[PDB]
Curated annotation (Swiss-Prot):
Motif Microbody targeting signal, chain ranges: 147-148
Function, as annotated: Major component of Woronin bodies, fungal-specific organelles that occlude septal pores in order to separate intact from damaged compartments. Hex-1 binds directly or indirectly to the Woronin body tether that in turn is anchored at the rim of the septal pore.
Record GO cellular component, one term: Woronin body
Location relative to the cell: Cell septum
Gene Ontology MF term list: ribosome binding; RNA binding; translation elongation factor activity
Quaternary state and interactors: Forms oligomers. Self-assembles into hexagonal rods.
Consequences of knocking out this gene: Impairs plugging of septal pores and leads to the loss of cytoplasm in hyphae severed by lightly drawing a scalpel blade.
Native source organism of the sequence: Neurospora crassa (strain ATCC 24698 / 74-OR23-1A / CBS 708.71 / DSM 1257 / FGSC 987)
Family designation: Belongs to the eIF-5A family. Hex1 subfamily.
Principal subcellular localization: other
Biological processes per GO annotation: positive regulation of translational elongation; positive regulation of translational termination; translational elongation
First and last residues shown, out of full length: 28 to 175 of 176
Name of the protein this chain belongs to: Woronin body major protein
Length: 148
C-alpha cells in the first residue's frame, strides 16, 4: 500500500524536502516553473531506487478567490532505535512492534550521525521512517527532548 500523505502548499516547499513524485517518495533537487502552465515543477530523487522523477503542482480552487498549488508529502513515522548492526537498525514502533532489519538511507551521513547519537543516549534517539508499498526506511533522525 502506498504511503499515507499530507498536503503541502507549494510556497512551503524547499530544496531537500521529501515529496511524493509520480507516486514515489523523492528528495526534491530542483524546483522550476513550467512555461506552458506557469505551475511549479518538481524534480526529485527516489529515496529507494535513486531514480529521477518529475511532477507538477496540483492547482485547486476550493473557495471563491482561493487558488491553491499543493504537493503531497509522506507521513513520517517515528521509531525508537534498539540496536545498530551492519548498515541496518533494530527499531521499535510506538506500540512495541520490533523491526529487526530496518535499512538506513545513505544520505547526508545519516548512519554516522545516528551512530554518534546512539552511543551517547540510545532511547533519546528516534528515526523518521518513510513507508512506501510495504518497504520501510529510516531517512532522518531526532534526539527526543527529555521532557518527552
Amino acid at each position: 500500500s502506498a504511503s499515507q500523505t499530507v498536503t503541502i502548499p507549494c510556497h512551503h516547499i524547499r530544496l531537500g524536502d521529501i515529496l511524493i513524485l509520480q507516486g514515489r517518495p523523492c528528495q526534491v533537487i530542483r524546483i522550476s516553473t513550467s512555461a506552458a502552465t506557469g505551475q511549479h515543477r518538481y524534480l526529485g530523487v527516489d529515496l529507494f531506487t535513486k531514480q529521477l522523477h518529475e511532477e507538477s503542482s496540483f492547482v485547486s480552487n476550493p473557495a471563491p478567490s482561493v487558488v491553491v498549488q499543493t504537493m503531497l508529502g509522506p507521513v513520517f513515522k517515528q521509531y525508537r532505535v534498539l540496536d545498530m548492526q551492519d548498515g541496518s537498525i533494530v527499531a521499535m514502533t510506538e506500540t512495541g512492534d520490533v523491526k529487526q532489519n530496518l535499512p538506513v538511507i545513505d544520505q547526508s551521513s545519516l548512519w554516522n550521525r545516528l551512530q554518534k547519537a546512539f552511543e551517547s543516549g540510545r532511547g533519546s534517539v528516534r528515526v523518521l521512517v518513510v513507508s512506501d508499498h510495504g518497504r520501510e526506511m529510516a531517512v532522518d533522525m531526532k534526539v527526543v527532548h527529555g521532557s518527552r
